[PDB]
Amino acid sequence: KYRVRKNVLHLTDTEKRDFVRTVLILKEKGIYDRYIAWHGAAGKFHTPPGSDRNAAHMSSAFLPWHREYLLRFERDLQSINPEVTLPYWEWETDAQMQDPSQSQIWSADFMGGNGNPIKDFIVDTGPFAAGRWTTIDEQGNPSGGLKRNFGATKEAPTLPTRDDVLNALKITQYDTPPWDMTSQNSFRNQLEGFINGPQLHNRVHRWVGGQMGVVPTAPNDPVFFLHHANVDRIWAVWQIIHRNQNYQPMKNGPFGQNFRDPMYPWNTTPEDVMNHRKLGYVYDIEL
Amino acid sequence: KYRVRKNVLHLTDTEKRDFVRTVLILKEKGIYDRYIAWHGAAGKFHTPPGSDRNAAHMSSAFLPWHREYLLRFERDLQSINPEVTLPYWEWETDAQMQDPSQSQIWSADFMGGNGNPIKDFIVDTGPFAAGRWTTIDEQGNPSGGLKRNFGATKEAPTLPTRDDVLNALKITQYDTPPWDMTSQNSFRNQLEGFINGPQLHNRVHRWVGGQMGVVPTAPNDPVFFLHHANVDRIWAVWQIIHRNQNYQPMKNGPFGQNFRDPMYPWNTTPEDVMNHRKLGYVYDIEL
Numbered sequence A, B: 001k002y003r004v005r006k007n008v009l010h011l012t013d014t015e016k017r018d019f020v021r022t023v024l025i026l027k028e029k030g031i032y033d034r035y036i037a038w039h040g041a042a043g044k045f046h047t048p049p050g051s052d053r054n055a056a057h058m059s060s061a062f063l064p065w066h067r068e069y070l071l072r073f074e075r076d077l078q079s080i081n082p083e084v085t086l087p088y089w090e091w092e093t094d095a096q097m098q099d100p101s102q103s104q105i106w107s108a109d110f111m112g113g114n115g116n117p118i119k120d121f122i123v124d125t126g127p128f129a130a131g132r133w134t135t136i137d138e139q140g141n142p143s144g145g146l147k148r149n150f151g152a153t154k155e156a157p158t159l160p161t162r163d164d165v166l167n168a169l170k171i172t173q174y175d176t177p178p179w180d181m182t183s184q185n186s187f188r189n190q191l192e193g194f195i196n197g198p199q200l201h202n203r204v205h206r207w208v209g210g211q212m213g214v215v216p217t218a219p220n221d222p223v224f225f226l227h228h229a230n231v232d233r234i235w236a237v238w239q240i241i242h243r244n245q246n247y248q249p250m251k252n253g254p255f256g257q258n259f260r261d262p263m264y265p266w267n268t269t270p271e272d273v274m275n276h277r278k279l280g281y282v283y284d285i286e287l
């Protein structure tokens, strides 16, 4: 209830500078790459083998997995600067602009701009531009830079809208069987973005493009954590709205997906992170 | 001190049956696959990126990483049967046999036999034969069985010998710069098996063949844990002999390799596991 996560657009200039510098330190020390690898490894961990569910996506654990992911990341931020918290990119609002690429989140003082097509869509502006921020490929080897390509896809030309977020919050059940890509009338699946996909969470990944557009490399872009902080906030709002609803499945789902199953690659269970306030943080809209 | 890890050949018939039962339960529940994935993920996590060091091999963390690996595995065994410990395969004495494939470890009541060449070296005997034990590939997808092919390689036709183990125990320094494949006069690198490789640990992997021969898939074979229990025992013996030698590097090595750096994919540091008795187990030869 103490750690306040703020909207990116409400950050001061010094708050933007401190977050950027912290992330750069976490990168130089070797800690940041641990989060890239964790996310990539979980994407390859199928529950069970044979299915297309994985520990972090395409199944009920999607939301609690990333909440724990962000929690660990934020603790590592504070270990460098105890006054830095994880902001969230409220992309729903940004979708109201006729050109979301002009949002202040993409300014040279924060996340940097779009990819440069002359340099094969390498990001050449901002603190994470090529030459200041090294990336790694699916195999864990250097890959030569951060790439982005805003809205260049036919499947995700725009960012999700406010209404899209509102319609997801109307869903009553957290998730439904068979707890995967095909779950209907499921808040988890809707928010993840497989209901007439790509929508919401999935659509944001494909809208940014570059590393963010594919699972094994997405956390190479620091905006991954800003994106998922907003996803986590939307989940927290859904939990507040539906006081008579809890995580699903409680039991008899695939191992790694139940309420008290460990989420690879950790021992953390969904129950451990079900109450985000108990984890020591809150979103600014909660005050 | 409480958990005693016994030589595989010293197990009773009921001790062999209980261990096999435990491993099968851990497999059915979905816990076993977590160890396959953890080991594969660490093999892809290079320290630093670009180099051929990884979190679990080809560097100083090789020994403490696998000790923590076995420690977690043994705790998961105990969770099922608090009287089941993890035995060790003393392959240096098996190498004394004119045909080590006749060793009792490969009996139908324990690990099962060699691969069947008629069946492309699929294991068709023992509790882990095809049809009774499913495997997964490098991508985390089912792979259709356990394969073995004893001594079929030109680089590892035999198991490491005893004198090999004795000559490794003579080394004074735990490890030397540059803390990788090329480390000379290094117990870690000799044990691991890159000094005139493949030797010792590396040679056993290549001698078994099949999944055991291949980094991302080796833990598909339950004998992986028996193999590394013997590697861990040899390390514990070296620590008793050289009681005033300690882990190296202490600092200024690659991140993830120092005495107090976290070992991906965990937060565990080498220091946390430097004293194996403090971890709650001992080898039978220590009594």
Ligand SMILES: Oc1ccc(O)cc1
Binding pocket: A039, A043, A057, A201, A202, A205, A212, A213, A214, A215, A216, A217, A218, A219
């Ligand atoms: O790592 C990723 C997971 C899900 C996505 O939709 C995109 C990237």
Ligand SMILES: Oc1ccc(O)cc1
Binding pocket: B039, B043, B056, B057, B205, B206, B212, B213, B214, B215, B216, B217, B218, B219
């Ligand atoms: O981590 C590993 C090392 C050697 C292998 O043969 C397989 C896995």
Ligand SMILES: [Zn+2]
Binding pocket: A039, A056, A057, A215, A218
């Ligand atoms: Zn993802």
Ligand SMILES: [Zn+2]
Binding pocket: A201, A205, A228
């Ligand atoms: Zn995502």
Ligand SMILES: [Zn+2]
Binding pocket: B009, B010
């Ligand atoms: Zn004996």
Ligand SMILES: [Zn+2]
Binding pocket: B201, B205, B228
């Ligand atoms: Zn090994």
